[PDB]
Amino acid sequence: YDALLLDRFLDILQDLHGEDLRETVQELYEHSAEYEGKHEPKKLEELGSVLTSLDPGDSIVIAKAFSHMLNLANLAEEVQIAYRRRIKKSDLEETFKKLVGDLNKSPEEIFDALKNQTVDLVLTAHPTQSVRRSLLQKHGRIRDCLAQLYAKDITPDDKQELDEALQREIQAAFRTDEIKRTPPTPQDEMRAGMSYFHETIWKGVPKFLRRVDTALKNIGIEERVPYNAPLIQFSSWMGGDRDGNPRVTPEVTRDVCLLARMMAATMYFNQIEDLMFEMSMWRCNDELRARADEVHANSRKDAAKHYIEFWKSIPTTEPYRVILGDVRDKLYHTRERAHQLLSNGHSDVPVEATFINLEQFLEPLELCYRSLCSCGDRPIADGSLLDFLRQVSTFGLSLVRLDIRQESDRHTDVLDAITTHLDIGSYREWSEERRQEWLLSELSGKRPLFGSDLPKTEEIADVLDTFHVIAELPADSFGAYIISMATAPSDVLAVELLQRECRVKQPLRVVPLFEKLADLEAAPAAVARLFSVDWYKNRINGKQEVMIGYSDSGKDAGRLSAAWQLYKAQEELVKVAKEYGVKLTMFHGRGGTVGRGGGPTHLAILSQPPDTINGSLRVTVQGEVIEQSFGEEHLCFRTLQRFTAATLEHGMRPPISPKPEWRALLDEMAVVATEEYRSVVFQEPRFVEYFRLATPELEYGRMNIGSRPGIESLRAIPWIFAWIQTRFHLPVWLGFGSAIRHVIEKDVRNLHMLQDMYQHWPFFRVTIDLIEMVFAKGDPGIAALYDKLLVSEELWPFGEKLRANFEETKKLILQTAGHKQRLRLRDSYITTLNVCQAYTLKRIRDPSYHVTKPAKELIELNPTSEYAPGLEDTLILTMKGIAAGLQNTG
Amino acid sequence: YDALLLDRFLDILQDLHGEDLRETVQELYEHSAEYEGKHEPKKLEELGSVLTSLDPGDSIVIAKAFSHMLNLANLAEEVQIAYRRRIKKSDLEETFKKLVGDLNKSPEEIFDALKNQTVDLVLTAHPTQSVRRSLLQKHGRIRDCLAQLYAKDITPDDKQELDEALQREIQAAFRTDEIKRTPPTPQDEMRAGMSYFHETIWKGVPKFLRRVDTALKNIGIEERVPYNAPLIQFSSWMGGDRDGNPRVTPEVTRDVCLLARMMAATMYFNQIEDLMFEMSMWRCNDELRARADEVHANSRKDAAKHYIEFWKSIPTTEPYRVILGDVRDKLYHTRERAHQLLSNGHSDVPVEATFINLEQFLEPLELCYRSLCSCGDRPIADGSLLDFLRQVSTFGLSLVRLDIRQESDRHTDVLDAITTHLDIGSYREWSEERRQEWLLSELSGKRPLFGSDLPKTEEIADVLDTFHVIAELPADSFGAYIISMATAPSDVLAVELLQRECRVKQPLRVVPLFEKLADLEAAPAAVARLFSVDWYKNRINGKQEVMIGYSDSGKDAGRLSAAWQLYKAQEELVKVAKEYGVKLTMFHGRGGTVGRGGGPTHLAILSQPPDTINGSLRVTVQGEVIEQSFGEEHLCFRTLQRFTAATLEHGMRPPISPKPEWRALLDEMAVVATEEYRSVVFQEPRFVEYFRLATPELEYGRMNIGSRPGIESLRAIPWIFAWIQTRFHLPVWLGFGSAIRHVIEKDVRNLHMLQDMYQHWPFFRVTIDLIEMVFAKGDPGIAALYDKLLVSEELWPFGEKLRANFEETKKLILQTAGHKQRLRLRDSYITTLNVCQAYTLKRIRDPSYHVTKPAKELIELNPTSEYAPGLEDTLILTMKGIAAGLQNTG
């Protein structure tokens, strides 16, 4: 069946570029097959020799071919998973059954805990989505065709039309330039993010809630999940995160907020007419009767011809239609107002004519539900009206609440400008004590701080203006203000003061971001010191959120030491919050790749310390993971399923707490791991030199994914990207070798204790299992090829040293997990691209192949390329394709 | 499986009204089962005795129950047909194969004939749709649930959720008042009609064309049906037909025209963004390159924030996106202009900013298609772009072209006002010759006729103002001007002159309506006399359309005589048109019921005389038939399939022409039939008396279906309705008895000639077979019950006489067809309603049961009822239910 895609695609490839190129692709496929089979490292050079002959356009077409074959492989994989799972006629029903049988927990305990559980998924525009949106659509159509094909209810003509359809959709995908020729704007990122709503999430949330209702009824709970129960919520960073991104201006935040508001209004308006058509009952309570009579009083006996349906005044015979008719009016004016507010700078639509409250909207629909239930129509109410109720109470008036993130030093610059202009000192030079006392005196004082005549920099005015934009916009449009590089209470209080001083009517909650290992070590102390400030603890209202970054932790220290320190951090933060009677919810800045704290969602949630969630979880979805977990109905459902199940289990089934021997053992193990990591990534003075040559790191910025314009000083995303492209995975497994070897060296029974830990401690089991997965996607022969082709003859053995540790570390991993279904084949395509990526890099770093109208062929697609005509496009294509094959970018 | 619906519905009925009423419904079902089985006429009285006991509310609930059970039976029937047809893995592919094998016709002949073939389906608001739209939606949801259930890919939870869904949707249907409490406005009729577009037709037309493409490729024709080839078109009467309907004012026509235009604009706008996303190619011709460069010149470097997607200026890298971007702009302004024009009386949107031409729209899309084909992307072009092309060239800027219909006497009144005010005579008193000469002198003259100071009646001003409204609106928004009761060329020329004189820039074609038998007899002579007028034949441009009514023909004369005269009419009209070298297209005013010329569509088309269509057909779809043939994807497809196949076959496979012995035989047979018909329906002086008592005719107007406020002087719709409710079908079979008996009496070999005619002449075969179908839906015991319960003891034998002829006629029908799968059961429910309808009529026509806030029970739903509280609702419910069971209203 794997041969099917090969057949169809290669047929189209021959129909587009001839037999010769299809035969050369087939040769490359056969060489790569002999490599992923026999594993002879000579086969790689045998393949590269064939790759050198390729013309400038032909090499482009080859990279194109293997890239699209990898994409098709991903789509067929998704179809086969969805069907293989569907033909069974963790999981929600299974989780409920296990919670009842195993742990003796009762249905009402599961229902009660589930009512009070919340999962806040926040989508980010982190530049990890390699495939452009113009192609993502075509992939969606192709997986639709393949899903409809993988079935036994095909009527011959339908199958033929799907053949023509899949053929034309592949041809259309292959006929689009996969290369972003300009990087996006932040608004473009926010559109790419929100597109999953008016395509999947909007209908996916009500369906998922209905399924939860079904499961609860399969445990004996006739009751239904409350429509206003917040089981899942959505936040966004798109247009809000300005940390290190000067292109995210205040006008950008205004733009994305108004945008989201207009989208929400449009969706509700499209729904409301069909809902009005269904609510055709004539029985209601005395309550809904009285209200509908009120609306019919001010019914405006007018033509009302701007609508299509129900343009005549709605009779009181159908009262639900009266009330929903008023909801439609306020929806129409809400949409038109947001449309003008966005299109121009203003609107004449009266605010009283729109929905201003989150639940001015909800009130009439709630009334309809009470009416239907009182009159015996609970089945009807639990249908489209319940779907709509859940959509309102889940998406509100602005589809997603927007977070604003900014580094602490920018707030410090602002305050320093304020104290210098006020002739009271320099806030920068002040100690922490002084900053705290001053900020407190101003927060509790009543006199304004700065004035119109405060001297501002473009940066200072940037942050002040973002605060004014926050003040001008509705409160329910924003989420949290996240402080990057937050270290002291003065960093939070600075934001509270700048908010209050910028006349932010309803100030949003402040949340610190601890991402570097040093900040994670000292985080509980800082949070405790903040809660010690009685003013802040009294204004925090017993609830605090703090963000815990995962990207940078495993970059400066070992991955093992980073994970372990993260566990300690969560644990002691909960300790502090409990010590101050504050409900702490922790915001996990997880990635898609294990190197940035990624991995399977339920495994990541299981590897959290116990009693640290408590029905309140907040997780990032890094750009590319959005597509991974919401591009199809089934994907979206499996996502919300996975999250809510893992949280509920982690609430009622607490993971085992580590034995103290395991605590000290992991402390020692972490020390050895960190020394082993920094030994090779920072102590070696030639390491950065070898890295900038053996990996395609430097070229990452050429993909133009995001809108953001030594090794310690680079972003973690291209850091993981470099070692995953080469399939070496250094940042995933580095410290583990020396760690384990030292732990068995110091004591031989520590082997029995490692075996003991892998079979009982969820955190350790998940860590080791992830490392094993990452090893299963690794092949050191690739890194060997990159060294042989791109690294100078001098420090060739350096890489070999690494190659040693790799295998050594792998030997230890399987030794702890106790290990020694036949997918493979895709690694063949990937291998070809690996070779193509290596040789092309060699031709890129040369002088001869450097530079000293319309387009009718691929080579004319890059006229402003500093490198040779056909080369740059080929390199970008190789990166895209390899990322697709590995199902991860960074 | 029939028991399934009974189970589910009766479960809900018990959950809504208790065991007692469910048991009484079950008793009624069992009595009706013993009646439709044993056929004992005592069982009917046995059932009515049970019906008399019912409380006022309970009888309402019983009629409700059997009505909804009949509706569910219809839906299950539709599902079972669609699946039973789908599990085969006339018809298009079969028709092609037969045209090749049987008749030796070649593929290019079928393709050429199919290119030049047109089928114009015109939807009417004729008051035959008994079920209100508020309930029609619920039926749609219920058939969706039942369709998804009738399958073997159900995953347990999906099946349970569909159980809850179908339960709540039945409960919602049963919880709506099925009774229209006020009759609709014409605009409401036009909305009900157009709703099938933005639900089924809009996506159904491209799919159907794709299927035709598939069939053509299965004959070896790689070519595709031209996007602009007009295989199917849609016209409307909703808001245009004012014949006898004073509520269809000129403002109504303006309203429905602007409405339709705004709907079309909205649909195109919703499509255009997704089409823009797909057309992401970068290769184009020099032509499309030059045009896209033109658009990028006047690109308006602006924010363009009113859009959601593509708000940035579209780069020339993707030229299809540039051009489709301009199409989107003109679509946005077209929609906004029509929206303001409708909402207010005017718009500030410049006309140059919108699409004014039918193919100003088409030009850029045509260019995109030429580009894709030239660059090798014909597969891509034959996808969404082809779907969109076909939708544009099929629906245009206003979804349907509107017809205006008006009776001739109103034009005559206008002209008489004009000649009297001009002091030149009285146009009424003028002979035909004089009217022709005068009208010709004015049409060819250049001086204006009437002025501002012409004295007008409300009627005269009605028609003049409809002409001004026609002049004010775009030409492509209107279809034809149909003249009711048209008898002379002066009737057509009057409309041509009134149009020209009301400054109708592009005057619409005039078409006469011959519906009464007298007018059909003299139609060819009148058309020939019209073509004799050289001025009109020179302005007609070789094309003429004439309408042929079917409703009134079978009302004043026999059904057989009516059908036969219709055949003669078509035949001699074609003779005249060929004699004048005019391409005649005939407009068949067919109904849904056989009594109004209804029946299966392919059978009606086959019963047309040969060489009378010639790739040009125009057929009405009477109100209720719209729902019958477009309420589901499958129904819509089977409809367009049936029509286009029947027309193509009737073009290449001409039906046999009648032998002259059959001509004279049918002439005699028609004379005997007409005398037999008028003998009982007009000669009998007590006939009208017996009719107004034995049938529920008089109560028809109580259903409030349409917006239109002796027996010769009633409408044909309630005429067929009365005899189908009682299941007697008098107007379908009346003349056939005496006709056949006289034909075998005059000559015994005429029996062998009838046997000869039934096996070779398609018109006769269809006629007899239809009569046999109508007999299969008849039961004279019902009419016997109505007589026994409602007809005075005096003329009881009169009905029995009719009952005699019934059986007698039936004996003859099966004797000609040579006749002597087990659905039945539904006739049980119908029978119950029959009984309920009879006894209730008896209680309605009494003095004791006559009349001399909110609502919380069914009896309070009618507070202004002249009859007893619970009675009127029960009668209306019985009519609705019986019509549903018989699948026909009138």
From Swiss-Prot, chains A, B:
The active site is at H126, K555. Magnesium. Can also use manganese. One of its GO terms (biological process) is protein tetramerization. The keyword Cell inner membrane does not apply. Coiled coil: none annotated. The modification Phosphoserine is found at S657. Induction: Upon inorganic phosphate (Pi) deprivation. One of its GO terms (cellular component) is nucleus. By light-reversible phosphorylation. Activated by inorganic phosphate (Pi) deprivation and glucose 6-phosphate. Inhibited by L-malate and L-aspartate. Homotetramer. Belongs to the PEPCase type 1 family. This is Phosphoenolpyruvate carboxylase 1. It comes from Arabidopsis thaliana.
